[PDB]
Amino acid sequence: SMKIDVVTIFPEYLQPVRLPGKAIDAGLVDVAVHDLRRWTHDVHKSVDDSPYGGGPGMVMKPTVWGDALDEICTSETLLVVPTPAGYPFTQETAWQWSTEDHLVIACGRYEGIDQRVADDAATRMRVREVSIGDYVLNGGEAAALVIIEAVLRLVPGVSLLEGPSYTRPPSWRGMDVPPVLLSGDHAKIAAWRAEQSRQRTIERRPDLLGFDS
């Protein structure tokens, strides 16, 4: 049983959470999405202001985030903050987080969240700032969806690159399935699949085998 809360100024973007959809239906996980503006108090519902020290764009205010996280989090919560400046989120991270009772995912916009939010929370609970890859996004919402998908498929109840896969018909547009795959020889099939994966890994991901680039 896992609970996941997501906090965002764009709750409508997290509707796709409805693979996680089948997990919710089975009653293994529960996912809830919260509008950050619920915790504002002014008429304009302001959540951002200009950065101290100068620079382009805006920074999300700590006051509003503090009130939201006070209500949603307990001392047992793992607070997840997607950010381009985070530690990398990997398959090992997904396995680690798959046995947690409660994830809270805080989605930033503009140029990010005041650093004191994570600092303050870390005095009360475990906090993890993470990146899902080295490309730039407008906000944390897409990253939250990737994290939820990677973690939920590992929950109890739900290396090298995979080579090419094939299914029927055995010949299509003059392209034939590799004959070894039709042969019923388990040893030969295993060997061929090993060689394919080796070739694909050295070509596409030489880093996984300890080579440059």
Ligand X SMILES: COC(=O)c1cc2cc(CO)sc2[nH]1
Binding site listing: 82, 108, 131-137
Q: How far is the CB of 64 from its own copies (least distance, A)?
A: 11
Q: Is 99 exposed, middle or buried (0-12, 13-18, 19+ CB in 10 A)?
A: exposed
Q: Which does 61 bind (CB under 5 to 8 A by kind): its own copies, ligand X, none?
A: its own copies
Copy the structure tokens of residue 162.
Answer: 């995979």
Q: Please report, in range form, the residues annotated as the binding site for adenine.
A: 132-133, 135, 137
Binding positions for ligand X, 98-117, rule CB under 6 A: 108-109, 112
By CB under 6 A, tell whether 82 contacts ligand X.
yes
Could you tell me where the DSSP H helices lie in 122-185? Answer: 141-152
By CB under 6 A, tell whether 9 contacts ligand X.
no
DSSP 136: -
Sign of torsion, CA 119 121 122 123? positive
2, 81, 107, 143: which one binds its own copies (CB under 8 A)? 143
Please choose, from the candidates 118, 125, 134, 52, the residue with its C-alpha nearest in 3D space to the C-alpha of residue 85.
Answer: 134
By CB under 8 A, tell whether 38 contacts its own copies.
no
Q: Which residue is nearest to ligand X (CB)?
A: 108
**Cβ-based nearer residue to its own copies, 24 or 189:** 189
Q: Which does 205 bind (CB under 5 to 8 A by kind): its own copies, ligand X, none?
A: its own copies
What is the rounded distance in angstroms from the CA atom of residue 143 to the CA atom of residue 151?
12
Phi and psi at residue 195, to the nearest 5°: -65, -40
Q: Residue 86 in contact with residue 127, Cβ under 8 Å?
A: no
Place of tokens 């001392």: 75
Q: How far is the CB of 27 from its own copies (least distance, A)?
A: 19
What is the rounded distance in angstroms from the CA atom of residue 93 to the CA atom of residue 91?
5
Q: Which does 140 bind (CB under 5 to 8 A by kind): its own copies, ligand X, none?
A: ligand X
What is the rounded distance in angstroms from the CA atom of residue 133 to the CA atom of residue 210?
19
Applying CB under 8 A, which part among 25-33, 35-43, 72-80, 165-173 lies near its own copies? 165-173
By CB under 8 A, tell whether 97 contacts its own copies.
no
Applying CB under 8 A, which part among 1-9, 32-40, 74-82, 112-120 lies near its own copies? 112-120
Residue type at 82?
Answer: P
By CB under 6 A, tell whether 164 contacts ligand X.
no
11, 51, 62, 84: which one binds ligand X (CB under 6 A)? 84
